[PDB]
Design an enzyme around this catalytic site. Structure first.
Site, PDB file in Angstrom:
ATOM      1  N   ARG A 257      -7.410  32.894  51.098  1.00  0.00           N
ATOM      2  CA  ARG A 257      -6.137  33.597  50.867  1.00  0.00           C
ATOM      3  C   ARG A 257      -4.886  32.757  51.218  1.00  0.00           C
ATOM      4  NH1 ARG A 257      -6.102  39.437  53.327  1.00  0.00           N
ATOM      5  NH2 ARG A 257      -4.145  39.350  52.119  1.00  0.00           N
TER       6      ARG A 257
ATOM      7  N   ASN B  52      -1.932  34.826  37.460  1.00  0.00           N
ATOM      8  CA  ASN B  52      -1.715  34.168  38.751  1.00  0.00           C
ATOM      9  C   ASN B  52      -2.885  33.318  39.250  1.00  0.00           C
ATOM     10  OD1 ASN B  52      -3.399  36.215  39.676  1.00  0.00           O
ATOM     11  ND2 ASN B  52      -1.936  36.949  41.237  1.00  0.00           N
TER      12      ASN B  52
ATOM     13  N   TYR C 120     -13.497  45.511  38.541  1.00  0.00           N
ATOM     14  CA  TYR C 120     -12.231  46.094  38.922  1.00  0.00           C
ATOM     15  C   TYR C 120     -12.234  47.625  38.996  1.00  0.00           C
ATOM     16  CZ  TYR C 120      -9.964  41.511  38.456  1.00  0.00           C
ATOM     17  OH  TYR C 120      -9.630  40.195  38.569  1.00  0.00           O
TER      18      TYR C 120
ATOM     19  N   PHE D 248      -2.420  49.853  35.204  1.00  0.00           N
ATOM     20  CA  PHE D 248      -2.542  48.444  34.790  1.00  0.00           C
ATOM     21  C   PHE D 248      -3.982  47.980  34.514  1.00  0.00           C
ATOM     22  CE2 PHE D 248      -2.191  48.639  39.495  1.00  0.00           C
ATOM     23  CZ  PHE D 248      -3.424  48.092  39.865  1.00  0.00           C
TER      24      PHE D 248
ATOM     25  N   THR E  94       0.668  36.832  46.181  1.00  0.00           N
ATOM     26  CA  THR E  94       0.278  37.462  44.912  1.00  0.00           C
ATOM     27  C   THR E  94       1.263  37.128  43.787  1.00  0.00           C
ATOM     28  OG1 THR E  94      -0.549  39.303  46.256  1.00  0.00           O
ATOM     29  CG2 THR E  94      -0.425  39.661  43.875  1.00  0.00           C
TER      30      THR E  94
ATOM     31  N   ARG F  17      -1.132  29.305  43.841  1.00  0.00           N
ATOM     32  CA  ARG F  17      -0.229  30.117  43.018  1.00  0.00           C
ATOM     33  C   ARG F  17       1.155  29.501  42.847  1.00  0.00           C
ATOM     34  NH1 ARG F  17      -2.869  35.624  45.400  1.00  0.00           N
ATOM     35  NH2 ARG F  17      -4.475  35.911  43.754  1.00  0.00           N
TER      36      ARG F  17
ATOM     37  N   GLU G  97     -18.356  41.370  46.403  1.00  0.00           N
ATOM     38  CA  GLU G  97     -18.009  40.526  45.268  1.00  0.00           C
ATOM     39  C   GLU G  97     -19.025  39.424  45.048  1.00  0.00           C
ATOM     40  OE1 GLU G  97     -13.946  39.231  45.769  1.00  0.00           O
ATOM     41  OE2 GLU G  97     -13.161  41.281  45.479  1.00  0.00           O
TER      42      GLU G  97
ATOM     43  N   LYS H 294      -9.088  32.027  37.344  1.00  0.00           N
ATOM     44  CA  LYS H 294      -8.851  32.946  36.243  1.00  0.00           C
ATOM     45  C   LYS H 294      -8.628  32.229  34.913  1.00  0.00           C
ATOM     46  CE  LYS H 294      -6.947  36.664  39.062  1.00  0.00           C
ATOM     47  NZ  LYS H 294      -5.698  37.421  39.323  1.00  0.00           N
TER      48      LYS H 294
ATOM     49  N   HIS I  33      -8.331  34.575  41.983  1.00  0.00           N
ATOM     50  CA  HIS I  33      -8.676  35.741  42.771  1.00  0.00           C
ATOM     51  C   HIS I  33      -9.381  35.233  44.009  1.00  0.00           C
ATOM     52  CE1 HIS I  33     -10.864  39.409  43.991  1.00  0.00           C
ATOM     53  NE2 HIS I  33     -11.851  38.558  44.222  1.00  0.00           N
TER      54      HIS I  33
END
Lengths: 139, 137
Positions: free
Chosen positions: B85, B112, B49, B57, B91, B102, B126, B9, B115
């Site tokens: 993951r 964070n 998204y 949000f 998260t 993270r 995706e 990100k 993704h």
């Protein structure tokens, strides 16, 4: 000029070894930003065009087959003295002669499989960046 | 032996920790199968998204995902979806275990770092979103 740009290629030997992140970190840890980047597979023709100056020597065929033997990661590295800094971080072309802590000392197998390419002057950097990237890829 | 979508990100790209993060993947059984640094448009981030577009949000999320460029990759390996993951971590960065992306590189729930696809089905979706047939020939 904090905006000097140079071309970096992580060659197919280093890509196959899975040390792309370690190599990129050598750049980012040393004042160079990854301004653009993609993993790409070169065709025979593309590697021939990129290396047209070595059309000269015997080792041209071998250089081309190597450079297309798998995918590469091409990047624009940007920062103060980027051209020379990248060369310093890469180390001598012969891994045997490369200084400790350089990419070629750490990750290169031989002269022929020497992990990384970097532009050798501002002039060549301009030509090599244009070969790989359109302006919209620089972000 | 699967593929999953990873995005580094804008917060992590801006910090210049792209190589450190990629190395977490490569040192842990994931190969980088495809990869590009790109600047997402508002439109593109809204499409990506879109399942959350009635959530409150949506706006900030979109704004953050376009605030700078990202690095989008396909990661390939045994159990890639879950492995990605596990490497990303919780998260909420405050809850992320040690040695996770993270825990080491993320500032908050909002910024964070990364993704990752959350299932095989979403992986396929995706991946197809970012990497369409484009080798002109």
């Amino acid at each position: 000029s904090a905006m000097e740009k140079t071309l970096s290629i992580i060659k197919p030997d280093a890509v196959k070894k899975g040390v792309i992140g370690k190599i990129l970190d050598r750049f980012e840890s040393n004042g160079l930003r990854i301004a653009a980047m993609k993993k790409v597979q070169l065709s025979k023709e593309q590697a021939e065009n990129f290396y047209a100056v070595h059309k000269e020597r015997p080792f041209f065929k071998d250089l081309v087959e190597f450079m297309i033997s798998g995918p590469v990661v091409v990047s624009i590295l940007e920062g103060e003295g980027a051209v020379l800094k990248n060369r310093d971080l890469m180390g001598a072309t012969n891994p045997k002669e490369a200084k400790a802590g350089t990419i070629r000392a750490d990750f290169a197998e031989s002269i022929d499989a020497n992990a990384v390419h970097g532009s050798d002057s501002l002039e060549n950097a301009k030509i090599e960046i244009e070969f790989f990237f359109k302006p919209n890829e620089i972000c």
